[PDB]
Design a protein around this ligand. Structure first.
Ligand SMILES: *C(=O)N1C[C@H](NOS(=O)(=O)O)CC[C@H]1C(=O)NOCCN
Ligand SMILES: *C(=O)N1C[C@H](NOS(=O)(=O)O)CC[C@H]1C(=O)NOCCN
Ligand SMILES: [Cl-]
Lengths: 241, 241
């Protein structure tokens, strides 16, 4: 019988091109088949870093910590290194600019008990929030693999997570990254100072391709490689032109 | 003091460069102020043509004629002149490719009594569904002006139409046309063999600009001018780069 998961090591060329190493995992929804350049790493667990703003957003919305995507979270007045963080934000722009202090406030409002209960209900990674309530996704005990990111994202796409359909629709709106006549990308980046992530999906007219990639990332100088390498794989597989 | 609507006739150069005649109407949501090259034409009511797939979609969803944006509507097997129509579609692709026969089926299932009641509730144009329930927006009595399109779109943007929030969120998803790091466009085209339309809005980080344009369109050869002329205006006003 056909294989649910297939390894394609030719994608390693896209990583070694940049003296890098990592994994891309693709899932073809229509075919119910997955593809990766590294089966082992596809299933190894890493800190989610800023990809955690997907579940964090869902929980904050479902609990009413965030009322809607227009509610303004005012800048606290502390000038931070990332200039786009030094202003007021809403859910859309806080996702787009990956505004850590806004999401730390969400996590504090959610609190440990409800955060843990929600991650258990989401079957999210190892479901472990050990560490600080407002930083465990960057320096605490939670871990998730690329294949587990895909599992979670497929549930979100199909409105199957254990939060309201409304919360799921709002977060999918906030994940919008790129759209044109050929495809729509909904995704989220992350970086934990050692590993970079890009997770999300590509919507086509008659199919959707889920993706989760992580790569060794010793400095922020190479962060654009997260999208660049993933797009080289998508182009090789004829998913985008 | 300042006026709700200001006339900026310099935009006429974008129509005359293409030997065209028409109107662009913009509404700055933050400032609660509008701008147009021709206030009279901005208030002239025309057949909506395919821009009617916005309210049609909302009504079909709210009544359960369309269950969700993934439900497949099978091709009826009749080969029509637009090749993209001769295939199965869902709500997303039916809007993207402006698939009239799919929307005619929605309209028949809605039926005239519910269609009329819902257009009255929407305050949509002249609310007149005279003609066939499955063609009145193409050859019947309904008429809507560019400023009336903006009024309708503003209600949709704010979830203020008299249908569920879910229906409004799904339709706004289906209107997605373009997105990048600078802007998001949600919009719908139309053409009635005499005039072409483009209506929708541009989402920025900290503002929304609604737009409605129509132009004289003797042949289908110049249909790309609907978006090109609008974008020239958006560029002149520094809304998009
Ligand atoms: C999350 O992964 N973040 C926040 C921000 N996101 O940028 S993105 O990775 O491009 O989405 C910057 C990187 C990362 C951090 O939190 N970096 O700070 C690490 C030390 N506090
Ligand atoms: C509506 O305006 N339509 C449907 C389709 N839309 O193309 S768009 O202008 O690019 O949105 C083709 C043009 C127009 C029609 O005239 N078609 O409706 C009659 C077909 N039964
Ligand atoms: Cl969207």
């Amino acid at each position: 019988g056909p294989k649910e998961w297939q390894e394609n090591k030719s994608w390693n060329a896209h990583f070694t091109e940049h003296k890098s190493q990592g994994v891309v995992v693709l899932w073809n929804e229509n075919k119910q088949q997955g593809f990766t350049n590294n089966l082992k790493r596809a299933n190894q667990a890493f800190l989610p870093a800023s990809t955690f703003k997907i579940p964090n957003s869902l929980i904050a919305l479902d609990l009413g910590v965030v009322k809607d995507e227009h509610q303004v979270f005012k800048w606290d007045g502390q000038t931070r290194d990332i200039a786009t963080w030094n202003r007021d934000h809403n859910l859309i722009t806080a996702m787009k600019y990956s505004v850590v202090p806004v999401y730390q406030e969400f996590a504090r409002q959610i609190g440990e008990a409800r955060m843990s209960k929600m991650l258990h209900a989401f079957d999210y990674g190892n479901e472990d929030i050990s560490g600080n309530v407002d930083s465990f996704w960057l320096d605490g005990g939670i871990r998730i693999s690329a294949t587990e990111q895909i599992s979670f994202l497929r549930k979100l796409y199909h409105n199957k997570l254990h939060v309201s359909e409304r919360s799921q629709r709002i977060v999918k709106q906030a994940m919008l990254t790129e759209a044109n006549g050929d495809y729509i990308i909904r995704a989220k980046t992350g970086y934990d100072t050692k590993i970079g992530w890009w997770v999300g999906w590509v919507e086509l007219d008659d199919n959707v391709w889920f993706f989760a990639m992580n790569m060794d990332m010793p400095t922020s100088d190479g962060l654009g490689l997260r999208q660049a390498i993933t797009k080289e794989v998508l182009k090789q597989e004829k998913i985008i032109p």
